[PDB]
Structure 1
Amino acid sequence: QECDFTPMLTGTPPPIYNFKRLVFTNCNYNLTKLLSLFQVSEFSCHQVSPSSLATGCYSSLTVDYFAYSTDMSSYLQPGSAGAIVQFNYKQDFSNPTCRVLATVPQNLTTITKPSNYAYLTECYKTSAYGKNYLYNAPGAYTPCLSLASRGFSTKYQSHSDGELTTTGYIYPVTGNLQMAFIISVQYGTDTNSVCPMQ
């Protein structure tokens, strides 16, 4: 039975700090078919050749995705500094991963656009003298996710519950929507729970 990538093709992809995670087990995949639907600008594979990626057998296959402007590609690079790795998404390199940046063609209709691209500029607890920043663990959500989900309708809008404080930055989506996918694979327990279609 085939792995169904319909969910990422349907609806509006979330802001980066609230990325969507799809996990596939006990199914076969056709990654070429999924990727061919997008205009790929960048991609980067760690501990994989995309060939090995498109033809290997794993115990599970995880896909994280979110709306993301391609020109912010460097902030997603391994070892990068700044708000994106700090407060939004820090890639987990403990497993073979591939990061793909792509533009959604208008010919692809089921994907809808948000009004704004968005990311967190900070996530902290107030100390006594300054801010005690809280940084993303690899592959995990910001601890400011609950606050961030309150939404941002202006630039540098803040949210707090007393303890935590977050601040988001927003800007209009101009042109075709651009996205990021992080494909991750695991070699556990289950040898060939996930294999390439044939």
Structure 2
Amino acid sequence: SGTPPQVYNFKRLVFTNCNYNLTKLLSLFSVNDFTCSQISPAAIASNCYSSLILDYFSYPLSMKSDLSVSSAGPISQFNYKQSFSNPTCLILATVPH
């Protein structure tokens, strides 16, 4: 809902003690990039976790390689860095037709 912000003004949603289901969320997703830093991509919706913090933003697939922590570009410099000590995931999706 609404305009997704940019990668440096990423919109934070913290989820705790609520039910989430990616199968009802990924069913409307034309996901292009599906990677997960320091954790598996497939079992992200499977296991139970204490907290899930999800920052969503507008991010093209043309700038995809700056998403990683090991990247030295602008995104890992000044825009958004993911957690080293916590499991992390980078998903770039496209709007379905």
Same fold? TM cut 0.5: yes
Opposite residue 29 of structure 1, the aligned amino acid is Y
More helix by share: 2
Unaligned runs of 5+ in 1: 1-9, 107-198
Equivalent residues in 2 for 1:4-23 (5 A)? Answer: 10-23=1-14
Partner of 1:70: 61
SS at 1:43's partner residue?
strand
Alignment of 1:96 with 2:87, yes or no, is: yes
Partner of 1:87: 78
The alpha carbon displacement at 1:93 in A equals 2.4
The alpha carbon displacement at 1:74 in A equals 0.6
Partner of 2:17: 26
What is the aligned counterpart of 1:50 among 20, 41, 47? 41
More strand by share: 1
Count residues in correspondence.
97
Opposite residue 96 of structure 2, the aligned amino acid is P
CA distance in 2, matches of 1:93, 1:36: 29
Identity of aligned residues (%): 68
Query: Does the 8 Å contact 2:31/2:92 carry over to 1?
Result: yes
The alpha carbon displacement at 1:46 in A equals 3.0
Opposite residue 54 of structure 2, the aligned amino acid is V
The alpha carbon displacement at 1:25 in A equals 0.9
SS at 1:17's partner residue?
coil
CA distance in 2, matches of 1:46, 1:72: 17
Equivalent residues in 2 for 1:1-198 (5 A)? Answer: 10-106=1-97
Query: Does the 8 Å contact 2:35/2:91 carry over to 1?
Result: yes
1:71-114 alpha-carbon deviations (Å, 9 max, x no partner): 100111231012111111111122112210110124xxxxxxxx
Opposite residue 47 of structure 2, the aligned amino acid is G
TM-score between both structures, scaled by the size of structure 2: 0.88
CA distance in 2, matches of 1:100, 1:90: 14
Question: What's the RMSD between the two structures over aligned residues?
Answer: 1.4
